[PDB]
Amino acid sequence: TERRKAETRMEIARAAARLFVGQGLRATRAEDIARAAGVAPRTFYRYFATKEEAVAPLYALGAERWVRAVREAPAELSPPEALERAVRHTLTPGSWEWARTLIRLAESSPALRKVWAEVCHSTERGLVQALAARMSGGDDNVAVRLAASPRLHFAAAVAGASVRVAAEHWASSPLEQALLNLEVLRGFAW
Amino acid sequence: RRKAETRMEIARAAARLFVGQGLRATRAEDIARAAGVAPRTFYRYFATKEEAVAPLYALGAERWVRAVREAPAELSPPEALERAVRHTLTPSAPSWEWARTLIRLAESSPALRKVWAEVCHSTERGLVQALAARMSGGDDNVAVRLAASPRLHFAAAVAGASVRVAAEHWASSSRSPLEQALLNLEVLRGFAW
Fold this sequence. Notes:
Chain A is an all-alpha fold. Chain A has ten helices and no strands.
């Protein structure tokens, strides 16, 4: 593995975030982010095509924590339990306000909305792979069948949406909403 | 204005090429040539080759939202939702067959997946406005309250996902997206409007 690429990507991301909240997206330019990250423009563009794409790593961070929390939940737990536990772990504060502002920024920028939508959408497949495993009964072979299941694809989307929508509303106006939202899966044919 | 006309011409050109030659083989410059436009003009509208398909995707998504809005007023939201799904996912095979291919392409390209995810997500806000109006009782003032409702935001997301997921599976296998979408929607049976 080489996480150095990954290390540098985050450093740039954290720089972009401070600037976007500090000065706004329009005022901030890709070149300014590079300066802020203590790196050359050529390097910036090696990793990101545009200023807005530079936030993705921060978003990915929140989303991966959620998926990991589902995967790491104790085996004995049921999926909706695992889902409830995951939500609570992430969205009950471990900063917090800075998250609120970064998501808030997406409401006002199409380009940032794209990044946000893209990160959340990617999370879905991961989440299917987490849920599939949990129900798998240990057989990877049995699991792979379930991960190709449209029913599971939809459930994953609904769980994702429960958190994402809450987060979005929280930012524009999250725990209480996400949990309320999840209730819609109560009956779900897992 | 003109932008949209131009944007679609480029998009149709990209699509023909992606199916004709594949995504990797095709470059942004080739799309411009195909669209009868200079590269500078291409980049005026799109940052990358994959972003050029968005207008085609937007087309399918706007059909779905429009079908919710255009449903007869007397219809209840879930009825309106049911009507929209049926309209949106009941087929002009060349038009239906193209869609299947373009969505299929997303399964194999991360960059296209981004474009696909972004178009479907945009649809959500439009849909909340449509649903809010339906329940509005005509008062825009009463409507705006409902459009700020987190319960409605979630329901809109779930309806969107019901169609999108079905569409995605439809594209990847050798059926009707309709059956899956409706099945998926069942999760809103007795949702609180």
